[PDB]
Amino acid sequence: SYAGNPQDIHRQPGFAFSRNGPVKRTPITHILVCRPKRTKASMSEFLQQRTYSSGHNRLYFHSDTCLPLRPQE
Amino acid sequence: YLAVRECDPDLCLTCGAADHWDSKNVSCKNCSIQRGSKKHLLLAPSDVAGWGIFIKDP
Amino acid sequence: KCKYSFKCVNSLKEDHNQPLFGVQFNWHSKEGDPLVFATVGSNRVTLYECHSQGEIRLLQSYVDADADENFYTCAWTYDSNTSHPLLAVAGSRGIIRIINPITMQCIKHYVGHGNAINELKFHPRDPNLLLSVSKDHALRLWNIQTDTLVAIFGGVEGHRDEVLSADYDLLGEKIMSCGMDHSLKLWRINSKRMMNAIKESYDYNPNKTNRPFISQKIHFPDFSTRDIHRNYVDCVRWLGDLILSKSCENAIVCWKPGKMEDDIDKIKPSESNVTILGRFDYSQCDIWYMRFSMDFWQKMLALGNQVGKLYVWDLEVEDPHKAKCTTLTHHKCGAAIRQTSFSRDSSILIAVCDDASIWRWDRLR
Amino acid sequence: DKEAAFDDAVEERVINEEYKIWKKNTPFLYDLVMTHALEWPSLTAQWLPDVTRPEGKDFSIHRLVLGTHTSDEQNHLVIASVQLPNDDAQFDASHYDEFGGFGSVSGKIEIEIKINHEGEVNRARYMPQNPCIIATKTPSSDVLVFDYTKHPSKPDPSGECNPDLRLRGHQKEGYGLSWNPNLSGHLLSASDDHTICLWDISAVPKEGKVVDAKTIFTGHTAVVEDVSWHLLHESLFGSVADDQKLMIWDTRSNNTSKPSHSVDAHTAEVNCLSFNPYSEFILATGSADKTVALWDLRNLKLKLHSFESHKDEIFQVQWSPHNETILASSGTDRRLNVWDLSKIGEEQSPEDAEDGPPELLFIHGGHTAKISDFSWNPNEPWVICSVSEDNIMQVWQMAENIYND
Ligand SMILES: [Zn+2]
């Protein structure tokens, strides 16, 4: 899915992902490739990930309704 | 704590259940729910199913 | 007995061959401009433009088959500063899209409803206010100009169940709302708080303020009733100062809130007695989620039937409606009509079927 | 037009799909995959030389200077701290969670000092000699110099923090900045007003809020986009502008209008310039002609193997200091291409020719928007910090398996 700012996912048509200007977001860090083993070729390979993440990496919502909660809010 | 109870403000006096009513969390840690102070929570689509509550602070 | 006579002129069919729910005319078109009407159904919405001499032509067609989308409502409106007609469609995912046929592109999308939108109406004095009744046990008012939620009608004592449909008063001061909770609860927009909220939304700017727009949750309705409808109510109108709500009892009851002599605008919130005045009766009309639209001049009220028949009513003669009026039948009417629409001038009427097969009629005039 | 908007939408969709494809080739091409999404969008990157590997904690204390490029919400200047798996990487170690080789939980990307800024943060170039001071570029006519030690952390809900050192020498918005590793101080900035300005810095006066420009280099007709010094010799530096000339200017030449090196080196706009300390002669430069060409100081008129791999304007180039014949470039084509010299001008198999020029060795395609900045890590061999306009900071190490035997 979209790998950029989740805020632009629910934006109104004509402005979503339009790249008009900078968009604020929540801090997040991602780690998925720890260290390659640098092993050799194996037939059994032809025949888990456990990624590491931190912070807020999504868009939140208000409690009263389904209005998307901005990071500034 | 043995009786699984809070601290009555009129009985547990020096413990901290009565002093500084209009302030932040008191010294006694067995009075947070009585004061109504809790941690901020958020709402977002859950990574498992539906909505989920994500806490802002550790 | 009536003094009207409509005749079938032309008809067509859609490509997707799926049931069509919402169909409304363009009442906002003045004289000279030929009549143009829209229809919905499945994931592909279609327009139409039928000329005289019994000729119907297709103008435009759209499709939204990217996902498992659906459409129910086809409310018509217009843009004041732009002066092109707009069509409102929503359902399934609950996204409300304002299609602009002139530019052939969507103008805005509205999300926030907990389920599919069931009905849509537009406010008469200000054409930018949309009455959206969502299925998440609530009703909402949308301001199209600012794309903000003006008020969330429902709460502590509001909309225990899903609101199937809602209407407007003749002058746009009082708002009715039927629902699936067998309730005809009503939310006035006449309070000073309603005016304050409307003005604030008119002069609101989401960019300027960091805090979200402070919607007015009207938890307590100004007037509610249960005894009128034994079952759920799916249609409602405002015959002047009376109420013409309709439910699955194959009848549109014409009643008035409170007692007989009390003024409607001075009815106390604690009133708990209602009186029935009129009731228009037909048969074979027991299906759910079907709407009726009366003529602008209020002399004509029409409600589609599931068998295939049509009914017109007289609502201006002395005393409430009586007698039997007349019925309109088409040669190729086999499906279920879910909505009917008149024109601003009482000369053109088009009925939609359960296959997006519009049947346009024409009065002798 | 509507067709143009539809084409842009399709292009964005294809960019997203290509990025999703690229994400899968993380382990087979990289040693580490660390991408952090800064809250305030990043416009620059750097690598602080601080390191600390205590006993019982195999990680190394690595600090990186992030950025802040949102419109206006209490503009800040973020400085964080990161770790490294070290020799004992311990990918699983039957206990990875922190991991068995470094910090993989809690303060992975924790922010140390957040000094409030006034405007936008274009560059975050620090002084390697004295890593305490960090310089910043803003849309205003003045530069900002901060200090993550003296300034308190945990910013209050306020703004317009005084940096106590503002370098006001420019006129319009600036986009260039570079410090001198050889001599402490000596920061130069290339701005949009057809010129590049340099400040003495170094022993700046205490609480020197008002700082004038020590020198201004106005010799390029068109807008400049980068200004980088020479690692081997601190007496000269290169000025690159939209005018088709990757000019190199020698300091103390008593000529602020005519650059010492006036070779055009291109026929289109140029927006990047850098050299290599191990390979002093090697000097990659970026351009709009998509023909970033290596040049030699001894022989600049002759054209060496122009790396025919770019597809747009190039704004940031940098060669790897640790290695000998490794160079790299990045620009508006959101690709970080790493050059190579051993395969330049040599025979290759048809598959190698189909893959591209033999001299081009590595290309990094982990960006969605225009690449803002990229830099190698002085401590780690291959770790590179590259940032884009989508508020994404990427820390990764190019695999050394290709340089085996
Ligand atoms: Zn106690």
SS (HEC) of D122-147: CCCCECCCCCCEEEEECCCCEEEEEE
Contact A32 D26 (CB under 8 A): yes
C-alpha R_g of chain B: 16
b/e code D372-387 from CB counts within 10 Å (16+ = b): bbbbbbeebebbbbbb
D191: its two tokens: 């701005």
Q: Which of C109, C149, C215 sits opposite A13 (nearest CB)?
A: C109
Instruction: Identify all chain A residues contacting C143, using CB atoms and an 8 Å cutoff.
Output: none
Least Cα separation, residue C111 to chain A (angstroms)? 8
Length, in residues, of chain B? 58
SS3 of chain D: helix, strand, coil, percent, to 5: 10, 30, 65
CB–CB contact D41 A27 (8 Å): no
For residue B21, the CA-to-ligand 1 centroid distance in Å is 16
The token pair at C173 is 């001061």
Long-range contacts of A59-63 (CB under 8 A, 24+ apart): A59/A6, A59/A7, A59/A9, A59/A10, A59/B44, A60/B42, A60/B43, A60/B44, A60/B54, A61/B43, A61/B44, A61/B45, A61/B51, A62/B43, A62/C212, A63/B43
Give every CB contact of residue A38 below 8 A, 6+ residues apart in sequence.
D401
3-state SS, residue C266: helix
Tell the residue number behind the tokens 């403000």, with chain if given: B9
Residue C196 maps to which CATH number? Answer: 2.130.10.10
CA distance D151 to chain A (A): 22
The distance from CA C117 to its chain's CA centroid, rounded to whole angstroms, is 12
Residues in A touching D111 (Cβ below 8 Å): 27
Rounded distance between C-alpha atoms, residue C311 and residue C317, angstroms: 17
CA distances D218 to D172, D211, D246, Å, are: 14, 19, 14
CA angle B24, B29, B32 (to 5 degrees): 55
Tell me how far apart the alpha carbons of residues C336 and C72 are, in angstroms, rounded to a whole number: 15
Measured distance CA(C265)–CA(C188) in Å, rounded = 10
Chain B residues near residue A62 by CB distance under 8 angstroms? 43
Single-letter code of the amino acid located at D13: R
- Cα dihedral: D168, D174, D179, D183 (round 10): -40
Q: What's the rounded Cα separation, in Å, for the pair D67 and D111?
A: 12
SS3 C226: coil
Calculate the dihedral angle through the C-alpha atoms of D9, D13, D18, D22, rounding to the nearest 10 degrees. 120
State both tokens at D282.
Answer: 């090697």
| CA separation, residue A68 to residues A20, A60, A71, D233 (Å) | 20, 6, 9, 55
Q: Residue D304 in contact with residue D294, Cβ under 8 Å? A: yes
D38, HSE (Cβ side, Cα atoms, 13 Å): 32
B25 alpha carbon – ligand 1 mean position (Å): 15
**Cα–Cα nearest to C111, from A61, D351, D276:** A61
CB C253 within 8 A of CB C184: no
Query: How distant is the Cα of A57 from the closest Cα of chain B, in angstroms?
Result: 11
DSSP codes, A10-60: SSPTTTTT---S------EEEEEE---------HHHH-----EEEE--S-E
Residue C115's Cβ-side half-sphere holds a number of Cα atoms within 13 Å equal to 13
Interval between CA B27 and ligand 1 midpoint (Å): 12
Task: Please answer whether residues A5 and D390 qualify as being in contact, where contact means their C-beta atoms are separated by less than 8 angstroms.
Answer: yes
d(CA B25, CA B38): 10
Experimentally determined by: cryo-EM
Chain centroid offset of residue D151 CA:
25
- For residue D253 the two structure tokens come to 């030449």
- Specify the DSSP element, H or E, that contains C271: none
Domain count, chain D: 1
- Give yes or no for A16 touching D (CB within 8 A): no
What is the arrangement of strands in the sheet containing C117-122, beginning at the earlier edge strand? C117-122, C129-134, C138-143, C148-153, C216-218
The token pair at D44 is 């620059």
| Residue C2 exposed, middle or buried by CB count within 10 Å (0-12, 13-18, 19+) | middle
Distance from CA of C217 to the nearest CA of A (A): 10
Rounded CA separation C48/C29 (Å): 15
- Please give the torsion angle defined by the CA atoms of residues D92, D97, D102 and D103, in that order, rounded to the nearest 10 degrees: 160
- CB contact (8 A) between residue A13 and residue C114: no
- CA angle A21-A27-A29, nearest 5°? 115
How many C-beta neighbours within 10 Å does residue C13 have?
A: 12
- The b/e string for D193-222 (b: 16+ C-beta within 10 A; e otherwise) is bbbbbbbebbebeeeeeebebbebbebbee
Centre of ligand 1 to C-alpha B4, Å, is: 10
Q: What are phi and psi of D398, to 5 degrees?
A: -65, 135
B56: amino acid identity, one letter: K
In-domain check, residue D187 = yes
**Rounded to an integer, what distance in angstroms lies between the CA atom of residue C117 and that of residue C90?**
6
Three-state SS string over D370-386 comes to CEEEEEECCCCCCEEEE
SS3 at position D229: strand
Place of tokens 């060669």: D319
Within 13 Å and on the Cβ side, how many CA atoms surround A27?
Answer: 15
Is D32 within the bounds of a domain?
Answer: yes
Chains B, C in contact, 3 or more Cβ pairs below 8 Å: no
Q: Which residues contact D305 (CB under 8 A, 6 or more apart)?
A: D293, D294, D341, D344, D345, D357, D359
The one-letter code for the residue type at C134 is S
Quickly tell me which residue has 């009555």 as its tokens.
B8
Measured in degrees and rounded to the nearest 5, phi and psi for residue C270 equal: -90, 5
Q: Within an 8 Å CB–CB cutoff, is residue B48 touching chain A?
A: no
At residue C281's C-alpha, the angle toward residues C276 and C285, to 5°, is 125
Backbone angles phi, psi at A45, to 5 degrees: -65, -40
Question: What is the Å distance from ligand 1's center to B19 Cα?
Answer: 13
Distance from chain centroid for Cα D195:
20
DSSP for C294-344? E-TTSS-EEEE-SSS-EEEE--SSSSS--S--EEE--TT--S----EEE-S
| Tokens, residue D355 | 């893959």
CA–centroid distance, B30 to ligand 1, in Å, is 8
Q: Cα distance from A10 to chain C (closest Cα, Å)?
A: 8
End-to-end CA distance of chain D: 55
Do residues C215 and C151 touch, judged by C-beta distance below 8 A? Answer: yes
Note whether A62 contacts B43, CB cutoff 8 Å: yes
Q: DSSP E strands: which ranges in D5-148?
A: 30-37, 62-65, 78-82, 111-114, 133-137, 142-147
* Beta pairing partners, C183: none
**Distance separating alpha carbons of residues D239 and D220, to the nearest angstrom:** 8
| Nearby residues of C279 by Cβ (< 8 Å), 6 or more positions away | C251, C252, C253, C254
Q: How many CB atoms lie within 10 A of CB D116?
A: 19
Q: Is the CB of residue D233 less than 8 Å from the CB of residue D188?
A: no
CB C55 within 8 A of CB C12: no
Q: Which residue has the tokens 């750097």?
A: D46
- Which stretch of DSSP H or E encloses residue D350? helix D350-355
Report the alpha-carbon distance of residue D138 to residue D358 in Å, rounded: 40
At position D323, the amino acid (one-letter code) is N
Q: Please choose, from the candidates C172, C170, C302, the residue with its C-alpha nearest in 3D space to the C-alpha of residue C242.
A: C170
Q: Which residues contact D86 (CB under 8 A, 6 or more apart)?
A: D53, D58, D59, D60, D101, D102
CA distance D246 to D285: 7
The span from the CA of C1 to the CA of C358, in Å, is: 27
CB proximity A65 to C under 8 Å = yes
Q: Which of D77, D184, D75 is nearest to D128 (CA)?
A: D184
Residue whose token pair is 């009366």? C294
* Residue D301 C-alpha from the chain's centroid: 27
Which of C103, C108, C147 should we substitute to test contact with A (largest number of A Cβ atoms within 10 Å)?
C108
Under 8 Å between Cβ of C6 and C361: yes
B32 C-alpha to ligand 1 centroid (Å): 13
Read off the DSSP letter of residue C158.
Answer: B
Please measure the distance between the N-terminal and C-terminal CA atoms of chain B and give it in whole angstroms.
24
Write out B1-40 in H/E/C secondary structure: CCCCCCCCCCCCHHHHHCCCCCCCCCCCHHHHHHHCCCCC
CA of B34 to the centre of ligand 1 (A): 12
All residues of chain A having their beta carbon less than 8 Å from the beta carbon of residue C147 are: 12
Q: Coil, helix or strand for D233? A: coil
List the D224-229 sheet strands across, edge first. D224-229, D236-241, D248-250
Question: How far is it, in rounded angstroms, from Cα D33 to Cα D398?
Answer: 10
| Separation CA C179–CA C160 (nearest Å) | 9
* Resolution expressed in Å: 3.4
Find the closest chain A residue to B53 by CA distance: A60
Taking residue C171's Cβ as centre, other Cβ atoms within 10 Å add up to 10
What are the backbone angles phi and psi of residue A46, rounded to the nearest 5°? -65, -40
For chain A, the maximum distance between any two Cα atoms, rounded to a whole number of angstroms, is 56
Residue with tokens 């695999």: D399
Sequence-ordered strand ranges (E) for C155-309? 166-168, 174-177, 186-188, 216-218, 233-235, 246-247, 251-256, 275-281, 292-294, 301-304
Q: Is D194 left (phi over 0), alpha (psi -120 to 50) or beta?
A: left
Using DSSP, state whether D15 is helix, strand or coil. helix
Neighbours of C150 (CB within 10 A): 24
Query: How far is Cα D336 from Cα D334, in angstroms, rounded to an integer?
Result: 7
Enclosing H/E stretch for D328: strand D326-331
In chain A, residues with a C-beta closer than 8 Å to the C-beta of B42 are 60, 69
CB D240 within 8 A of CB D270: yes
Q: Give the tokens for residue D272.
A: 């990047």
Residue with tokens 């402005």: A15
Give yes or no for A43 touching D (CB within 8 A). no
Q: Give residue C281's domain range.
A: 4-365
Closest CA to D261 of D283, D279, D278: D283
Which of B43, B45, B54 comes nearest A63 by C-beta? B43
A61 touches chain B (CB under 8 A): yes
What is the amino acid identity at position D23?
Answer: K
* Residue showing tokens 């939304």: C201
Q: How far is D271 from chain A (nearest CA, A)?
A: 22
C-beta separation of C305 from C328 below 8 A: no
Nearest C-alpha in A relative to B58: A55
Residues D121, D69 contacting (CB under 8 angstroms): yes
Which tokens go with C144? 């199209």
What distance in Å separates residue A18's CA from the closest CA in chain D? 8
Report chain D residues whose CB lies below 8 A from the CB of A58. Answer: none
Our CA angle for D345, D348, D354, nearest 5°, is 105
User: Under 8 Å CB-to-CB from D357, ≥6 apart: which residues?
Assistant: D305, D307, D308, D309, D344
Pairwise CA distance, residues D70 & D100, whole Å:
37
Residue in the block written with tokens 């032509």: C57
- Show the tokens assigned to A62: 């208000």
Measured between beta carbons, the chain B residues lying within 8 angstroms of A56 are 54
Distance CA C338, CA C8 (A): 18
How far apart CA C107 and CA C112 sit, in angstroms, is: 17
In a domain, D166, yes or no: yes
Tokens of C178: 């039927």
Residues 5-24 of A with CB under 8 A from C: 10, 12-14
Tell me the shortest Cα–Cα distance from B11 to chain A, in angstroms.
38
* Euclidean distance between CA atoms D279 and A1, whole angstroms: 43
Backbone torsions φ then ψ of C266, nearest 5 degrees: -115, 25
Tally Cβ neighbours within 10 Å of residue C29. 17
CA–CA separation, C40 and C303 (whole Å): 18
Instruction: Provide the 3-class DSSP secondary structure of residue C211.
Output: coil
In DSSP terms, D135 is beta-bridged to D145
- Phi, psi (5° rounding) for residue D71? -60, -70
Reference A65, options B54, D295, C213; nearest CA is C213
Report yes or no: A28 at the C interface, CB cutoff 8 Å.
no
Q: Measured between alpha carbons, how far apart are the two ends of chain A, in Å?
A: 25
Q: How far apart are CA C349 and CA C304, in angstroms?
A: 12
CB C360 within 8 A of CB C348: yes
Rounded to whole angstroms, the Cα distance separating B32 from B44 reads 26
User: What's D386's domain CATH number?
Assistant: 2.130.10.10
Q: Do A36 and D31 touch (CB under 8 A)?
A: yes
Burial class of residue C349 in the structure, from the number of CB atoms within 10 Å of its CB (0-12 exposed, 13-18 middle, 19+ buried): buried
Q: How many domains does the structure of chain C reveal?
A: 1
Query: Which residue is associated with the tokens 């900078």?
Result: A22
Give yes or no for a contact between D306 and D296, defined as CB atoms under 8 angstroms apart: no
